[PDB]
């Protein structure tokens, strides 16, 4: 792997980084810089006393100095590569400002001296990971959720929906509701515990009102979770109330439509003659789409909104937590893509704005 192209998917929560042609990212680490509450600690150095900063908020880079620290860490600490040896594919959020795209390009070529690079939209890569070039992606990670309709690789910006509700908000909501049975989780470390509970025990009910009316009865619903220190907590309806928030954002006092509604609204902003192709190709990607039941719930909800004749297919791969990265690995490994890299020579001649003409 001395010169294998690199693929880096910079999330609000996790960096996923690795080598093109691999089936999974070699390195997955938190997108944080930590400082004493030695001057700074990046990624897992910080996770291991410190106040944390996330340089990407809701998928958009908002702290460039710390982002540069994150990229440095990715190359020198995590992947341990000389960046000059590797074409590098980066990812970006849908609707990323042009200035941001340019700055990422400038940093990669001028600061890290990469020989070639490219920037692709995260949702487009997830779509490609499924083998498709047309469809509508629900991409939901730690910091942001989007519905992104894509036709032949082009995201359709007028139809893109952004919702700030994503995994971090769901953790915070689970912390709040766990206060009802009386379990207090408060600190940054305790928030991580509740993230883990969310990931291990939460699920999306097919029929929420019925699941509530039932919980109240049964139970295989109640589940126990053992804390690091050996004590146990038990959770019941919180298991499915937490991610229900994706369908009912009013649970956290947000006025937004839920993700089934936003998917439908996004499809309805697209030309009518491509809608059938969108419905038949709804891809889910990102960690917050990992809840058991969420694909069946979306299928039910979209079916209820869509024309009754419409073929609806939700594609929710088991690796979807990494589908963006995987689609980058696949794309950067294709013969077809090699002509598409921005080369250092091209950058020298055209400057950072070359990204707009080459990455689309």
């Amino acid at each position: 792997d001395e010169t294998t192209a690199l693929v880096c998917d910079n999330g609000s929560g996790l960096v996923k980084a690795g080598f093109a042609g691999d089936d999974a990212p070699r390195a997955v680490f938190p997108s944080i810089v930590g400082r004493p509450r030695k001057d700074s600690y990046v990624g897992d150095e910080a996770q291991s006393i410190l106040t944390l900063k996330y340089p990407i908020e809701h998928g958009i880079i908002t702290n460039w100095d710390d982002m540069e620290k994150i990229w440095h860490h990715t190359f020198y600490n995590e992947l341990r590569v000389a960046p000059e040896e590797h074409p590098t594919l980066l990812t970006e959020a849908p609707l990323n400002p042009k200035a941001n795209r340019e700055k990422m390009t400038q940093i990669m070529f001028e600061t890290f001296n990469v020989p070639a690079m490219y920037v692709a939209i995260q949702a487009v890569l997830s779509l490609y990971a499924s083998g498709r070039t047309t469809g509508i992606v629900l991409d939901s990670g730690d910091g942001v959720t989007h519905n992104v309709p894509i036709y032949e690789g082009y995201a359709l910006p007028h139809a893109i929906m952004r919702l700030d509700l994503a995994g971090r908000d769901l953790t915070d909501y689970l912390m709040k509701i766990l206060t009802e049975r009386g379990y207090s989780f408060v600190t940054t470390a305790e928030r991580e515990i509740v993230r883990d509970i969310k990931e291990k025990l939460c699920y999306v009910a097919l029929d929420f009102e019925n699941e509530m009316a039932t919980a109240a009865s049964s139970s295989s619903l109640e589940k126990s979770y053992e804390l690091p220190d050996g004590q146990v907590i038990t959770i019941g309806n919180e298991r499915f109330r937490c991610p229900e928030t994706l369908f009912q954002p009013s649970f956290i006092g947000m006025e937004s439509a839920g993700i089934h509604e936003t998917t439908y609204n996004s499809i309805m902003k697209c030309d009518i003659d491509i809608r059938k192709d969108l419905y038949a190709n709804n891809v889910m990607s990102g960690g917050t789409t990992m809840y058991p039941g969420i694909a069946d719930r979306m299928q039910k909800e979209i079916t209820a909104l869509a024309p009754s004749t419409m073929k609806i297919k939700i594609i929710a791969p088991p690796e979807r937590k990494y589908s963006v990265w995987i689609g980058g690995s696949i794309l950067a490994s294709l013969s077809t893509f090699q002509q598409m890299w921005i080369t250092k020579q091209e950058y020298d001649e055209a400057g950072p704005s070359i990204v707009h003409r080459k990455c689309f």
Partner: peptide
């Protein structure tokens, strides 16, 4: 993951130009 990259390569190789999507009203002019 897709069972093959074969159709993906063929789709990329025959990808329409942006101007065509605009003419078709799939994309807005920009």
């Amino acid at each position: 993951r897709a069972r093959t990259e074969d159709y993906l390569k063929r789709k990329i190789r025959s990808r329409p130009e942006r101007a065509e999507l605009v003419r078709m009203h799939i994309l807005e002019e920009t």
